[PDB]
Design an enzyme around this catalytic site. Structure first.
Site, PDB file in Angstrom:
ATOM      1  N   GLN A  16      16.010  54.023 -25.383  1.00 27.88           N
ATOM      2  CA  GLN A  16      15.543  55.029 -24.436  1.00 27.88           C
ATOM      3  C   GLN A  16      14.523  55.962 -25.079  1.00 27.88           C
ATOM      4  OE1 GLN A  16      18.628  57.581 -22.820  1.00 27.88           O
ATOM      5  NE2 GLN A  16      17.497  57.813 -20.893  1.00 27.88           N
ATOM      6  N   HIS A  61      10.252  55.811 -24.106  1.00 27.83           N
ATOM      7  CA  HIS A  61       9.678  56.896 -23.336  1.00 27.83           C
ATOM      8  C   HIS A  61       8.349  57.357 -23.877  1.00 27.83           C
ATOM      9  CE1 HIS A  61      12.916  58.714 -20.516  1.00 27.83           C
ATOM     10  NE2 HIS A  61      13.008  57.396 -20.528  1.00 27.83           N
ATOM     11  N   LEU A  84      11.221  44.834 -16.893  1.00 28.82           N
ATOM     12  CA  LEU A  84      12.265  44.100 -17.600  1.00 28.82           C
ATOM     13  C   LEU A  84      12.994  44.945 -18.636  1.00 28.82           C
ATOM     14  CD1 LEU A  84      11.636  42.723 -20.781  1.00 28.82           C
ATOM     15  CD2 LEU A  84       9.581  42.153 -19.466  1.00 28.82           C
ATOM     16  N   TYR A  85      12.498  46.161 -18.852  1.00 33.23           N
ATOM     17  CA  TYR A  85      13.064  47.075 -19.872  1.00 33.23           C
ATOM     18  C   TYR A  85      14.094  48.015 -19.258  1.00 33.23           C
ATOM     19  CZ  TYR A  85      12.079  47.874 -24.820  1.00 33.23           C
ATOM     20  OH  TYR A  85      12.117  47.853 -26.181  1.00 33.23           O
ATOM     21  N   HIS A 122      19.677  49.713 -18.499  1.00 37.59           N
ATOM     22  CA  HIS A 122      20.677  50.730 -18.197  1.00 37.59           C
ATOM     23  C   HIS A 122      22.115  50.212 -18.268  1.00 37.59           C
ATOM     24  CE1 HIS A 122      17.514  53.512 -17.192  1.00 37.59           C
ATOM     25  NE2 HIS A 122      16.995  52.647 -16.340  1.00 37.59           N
ATOM     26  N   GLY A 143      10.177  39.017 -22.306  1.00 39.43           N
ATOM     27  CA  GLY A 143      10.167  40.251 -23.073  1.00 39.43           C
ATOM     28  C   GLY A 143       9.509  40.112 -24.430  1.00 39.43           C
ATOM     29  N   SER A 193       6.469  42.502 -26.312  1.00 39.01           N
ATOM     30  CA  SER A 193       6.849  43.319 -27.461  1.00 39.01           C
ATOM     31  C   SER A 193       5.925  43.069 -28.648  1.00 39.01           C
ATOM     32  CB  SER A 193       8.305  43.046 -27.839  1.00 39.01           C
ATOM     33  OG  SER A 193       9.192  43.605 -26.886  1.00 39.01           O
TER      34      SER A 193
END
Ligand SMILES: *[C@@H]1O[C@H](CO)[C@@H](O[C@@H]2O[C@H](CO)[C@@H](O)[C@H](O)[C@H]2NC(C)=O)[C@H](O)[C@H]1NC(C)=O
Ligand SMILES: *[C@@H]1O[C@H](CO)[C@@H](O[C@@H]2O[C@H](CO)[C@@H](O)[C@H](O)[C@H]2NC(C)=O)[C@H](O)[C@H]1NC(C)=O
Ligand SMILES: *[C@@H]1O[C@H](CO)[C@@H](O[C@@H]2O[C@H](CO)[C@@H](O)[C@H](O)[C@H]2NC(C)=O)[C@H](O)[C@H]1NC(C)=O
Ligand SMILES: *[C@@H]1O[C@H](CO)[C@@H](O[C@@H]2O[C@H](CO)[C@@H](O)[C@H](O)[C@H]2NC(C)=O)[C@H](O)[C@H]1NC(C)=O
Lengths: 557, 557
Positions: free
Chosen positions: B176, B180, B357-358, B361, B499, B503
């Site tokens: 997280q 951000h 896709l991130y 949660h 993903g 990345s």
């Protein structure tokens, strides 16, 4: 208590693009990482580099091979050797420019602010530290020569010296127009910032350097720009039709002002001439795409036409603009596929030294002869009707018949624009650029041992020596414009060897030259992809005019 | 008069990254340029591609080789095969992402506005045209399933399902925090814009996403950030010391608020934990550089430390974050020299599918157990003292001992944050993303023939079929989070295969990984260049804390 030891990087100890890093209080440490050389100063050559260093021909020897014996170049231009040589010219010239921009006007080191803040002019060599003995490092005098006595004694034109290659004013107004899209210094911010955030061939001088200006210049119908038809001919719109701030002089009615991408273009018939041409070209391409793609919106008709006009610009600059400038018998070719094999960053950042070497104001003549009569400088400048009085056909033919001035050798800058050279010498000193000799070592050239080796004759070198005091302290602008010209060439050696790395990196370093963009679908099918190719200067004028006048970069012979 | 023919690109006719271009009124034209294939649909394979297509192993077969037979990987990790394999993983995964960004949220075609306006989220596949029969193209129903009935019946957690790989909350709060810095959607502008213009690992969540916020967060003495020492420990400064707008709740005194790079980080002890760590790390590196370079200013101490912390971030994410996430026995290695041979654009543009896709949660647990007691969600959220009440040592050890939730398979998202998934399904529909099957064909995978092949069991596929109507109409979010998990893995196949391209392209696609920046002089000598290397998660916590607690991404066994 100590005599405050000298900054060791003032001596420029590192060689071959070695990075001077200060350690402790008085030591330095040259980082020779991937510079090819090793040792305390990056002077000890590696294995691969010692081979290439003892086999690299003289830069003045390569220009001799490309300008003599035309028979050999007839064969090269008609075989695949031309493509193979072009891959070599693009790769070797671009390796000198850092792939991401290294420094800028505020940081003399790699930093994320230098990479991200695109409002900065980048640079190739860092600036002279403020704690150096002399203002140029360690050599020279304690005060640089006078900015005006330098521009008047060496740069001021006495009599018009024509260009030996026959470059005309149609090239001059193209150069001034084509460069004002990435050379826009912000007067409010300072001398090292740019409003042209595109940093390359974005045609910001056509669609505006921002988005609000772009919307106010567009018709929003069929992806066209607002056009103002005057007595049959199509001209850019009046300023009250496209209310974007133009730097038109006070008093002239808005019916006469014309709104274009750049703010200053309305202050010369030549700058307004090309802005009228590309606007005619832009609205011309929009008609050819709406036919192929009726089910297209207003935005796609505009943004696809932009890439096409960006494509034509890069082609005409490579194959006609640079071609005439170099005088090479080898025909240059704009083919982005030639760089698909090499690692090549398709991004560009405008360097402050590129803005420097591009001050070709000696191009401008004594007066402007438009056909019958001959307009003076005060009659040509700020003329709001000469473009409409003559039309695009007449001005294009008139500028293609008048020779421009030689750049190198000095003493060929008209006195109405000599104040620009004084601002250049002053800006070069406020940016604190390294000496002219130190920039030659950066671009693969030996430094000038004497002043006579620079200018070519004895008298000019004698005065230039007493002014500066050392050849290793000569500034960047005088060394470029006072360098001895090649035989029958437009400028000296250092102008070609430094200008070519910036140009090809700024032209091929466009995202449209990338494999991801260089598809026919990018330009709206094969109809638009073939407008980028086969695009000539004549096809820009004669395809948008009622008659086809004489148009090229050379004068008839 | 006509029935208004259907847009032919609604059928997604092109294959293998072919670009659908509309011609005339009802025809299409697939541009198979450098797509490897030819024909009207880019379905006829070329020579080189027919060899690789009949020799490419299954994507579910490659993951089997990297997760079994540890003895073989012991040898590979201890030879140069590890470096040679890493060069292969970085090259193949990055070839899927366009080298310059192709499209964005406003243009479904190559355009200079898509390339220059960095305030846009880019994208890989264009959106479904508004004139398609169904909202997903040509298949499915006339109205997509309910956004809340989809998140409650398939995404809502019933009981906590742990992560089979043992991923802990120290990984969750890192994910997280680390994301951000390039996932900041602007509420005022819309759902397809970003305030994080850095578009990658710029550490904008540490130094601020703008420049005014950066200045107000810096001490301007020895290149440090403003630090607030509390009862011996160093914490980020109070909001009145660094007056930048923080999204702290109303009423809590400024003595308790803490100003950091991001505006939302002060709303979780975990987000504030890492912001405290990197601030301790930033002020730690500043002391190590001032010793080596006393003759350095305030700016260079800051901008050089930024690149170092950018370097440590890319290393820890490659070799620890992604490593734990993949579960591969092959040890990953962050060495930018492995990409010096390939053509690799060291630039990155954040795609809107990567933000999609991130949404992991399901990582978040039922409750937060900090050592002795067990805080609930309403006790953990917006706690302005838990970080200072426990110190960095206690919270780091506490988060490294609690398992996180499985991502794939669905039914593992805690109900306090289930509303985030509903905004994701809604945003995915307002961005008009192509079906889940169509994204698999873009990332080298066969589309799912049935719904049971997706989820793995019969009951969930039965309800997911009646809701959507066709497997070629399944949206992007449900297909990712409801896909059947690999045996003992954290998520399904499509999460790894989509993903990983984003990345590695976003990590190695940083300018510091370029040959121009990857020098020791960039990081202030070899002392700082070796901080980037050998940088571990333990060396981030234990080198900035009084005691060294347990810190990793896995729970003790
Ligand atoms: C490396 O380059 C420097 C700069 O040109 C050479 O000059 C030396 O500079 C140091 C400054 O710390 C002086 O103390 C020396 O006296 C200078 N040497 C000479 C000969 O003038 C330096 O010599 C070069 N080093 C090597 C090994 O060639
Ligand atoms: C701007 O240019 C126009 C022509 O393009 C100038 O007007 C002409 O001036 C010549 C003098 O050499 C006359 O012979 C013409 O009859 C004029 N024609 C028109 C249409 O005016 C005008 O003087 C220029 N303005 C300035 C300030 O120099
Ligand atoms: C190319 O792809 C399309 C889309 O999948 C295939 O489907 C055809 O689409 C057109 C639309 O213009 C219809 O008129 C045809 O009836 C469709 N064909 C079938 C078999 O359903 C199309 O067949 C593909 N072309 C080739 C040559 O394989
Ligand atoms: C914020 O967290 C603090 C502790 O980090 C909470 O205060 C503690 O609450 C527990 C109840 O489980 C008590 O046993 C402790 O004595 C308290 N310590 C302190 C220093 O207050 C606080 O309640 C949390 N705030 C909210 C709103 O949940």
């Amino acid at each position: 208590g100590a005599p405050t030891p000298v900054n060791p990087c003032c001596y420029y100890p590192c060689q071959h693009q070695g990075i001077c890093v200060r350690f402790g209080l008085d030591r330095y440490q040259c980082d020779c990482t991937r510079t090819g050389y090793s040792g305390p100063n990056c002077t000890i050559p590696g294995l691969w580099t010692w081979l290439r260093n003892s086999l690299r021909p003289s830069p003045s020897f390569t220009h001799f091979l490309l300008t003599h014996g035309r028979w050999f170049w007839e064969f090269v231009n008609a075989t695949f050797i031309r493509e193979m040589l072009m891959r070599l010219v693009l790769t070797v010239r671009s390796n000198l420019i850092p792939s991401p921009p290294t420094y800028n006007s505020a940081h003399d080191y790699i930093s994320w602010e230098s990479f991200s803040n695109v409002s900065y002019y980048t640079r190739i060599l860092p600036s002279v530290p403020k704690d150096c003995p002399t203002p140029m490092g360690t050599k020279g005098k304690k005060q640089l020569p006078d900015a005006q006595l330098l521009a008047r004694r060496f740069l001021l034109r006495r009599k018009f010296i024509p260009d030996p290659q026959g470059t005309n004013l149609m090239f001059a107004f193209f150069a001034q127009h084509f460069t004002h899209q990435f050379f826009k210094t912000s007067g409010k911010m300072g001398p090292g910032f740019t409003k042209a955030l595109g940093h390359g061939v974005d045609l910001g001088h056509i669609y505006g350097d921002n988005l609000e200006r772009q919307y106010q210049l567009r018709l929003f119908k069929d992806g066209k720009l607002k056009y103002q038809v005057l007595d049959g001919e199509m001209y850019p719109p009046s300023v009250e039709e496209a209310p974007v701030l133009m730097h038109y002089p006070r008093g002239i009615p808005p019916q006469s002002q014309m709104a274009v991408g750049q703010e200053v273009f309305g202050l010369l018939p030549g700058l307004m001439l090309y802005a009228t041409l590309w606007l005619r070209e832009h609205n011309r391409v929009c008609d050819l795409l709406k036919a192929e793609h009726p089910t297209w919106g207003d935005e796609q008709l505009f943004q696809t036409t932009r890439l096409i006009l960006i494509g034509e610009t890069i082609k005409i600059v490579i194959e006609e603009y640079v071609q005439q400038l170099s005088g090479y018998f080898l025909q240059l070719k704009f083919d982005p596929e030639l760089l698909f094999g090499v690692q090549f960053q398709y991004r560009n950042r405008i360097a402050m030294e590129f803005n420097h070497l591009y001050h070709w104001h000696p191009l401008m003549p004594d007066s402007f002869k438009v056909g019958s009569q001959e307009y003076s400088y005060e009659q040509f400048l700020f003329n709001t009707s000469m473009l409409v009085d003559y039309g695009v056909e007449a001005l294009v033919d008139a500028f293609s018949r008048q020779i421009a001035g030689r750049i190198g050798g000095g003493r060929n800058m008209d006195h109405h624009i000599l104040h620009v050279a004084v601002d250049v010498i002053r800006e070069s000193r406020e940016m604190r650029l390294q000496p002219f000799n130190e920039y030659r070592k950066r671009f693969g050239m030996k430094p000038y041992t004497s002043f006579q080796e620079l200018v070519g004759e004895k008298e000019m070198a004698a005065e230039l020596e007493e002014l500066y005091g050392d050849i290793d302290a000569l500034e960047f602008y005088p060394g470029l414009l006072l360098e001895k010209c090649h035989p029958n060439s437009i400028f000296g050696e250092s102008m070609i060897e430094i200008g070519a790395p910036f140009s090809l990196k700024g032209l091929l370093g466009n995202p449209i030259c990338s494999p991801e963009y260089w598809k026919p679908s990018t330009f709206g099918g094969e109809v638009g992809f073939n407008i980028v190719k086969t695009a000539t200067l004549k096809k820009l004028v004669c395809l948008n005019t009622k008659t086809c006048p004489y148009v090229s970069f050379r004068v008839p012979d």
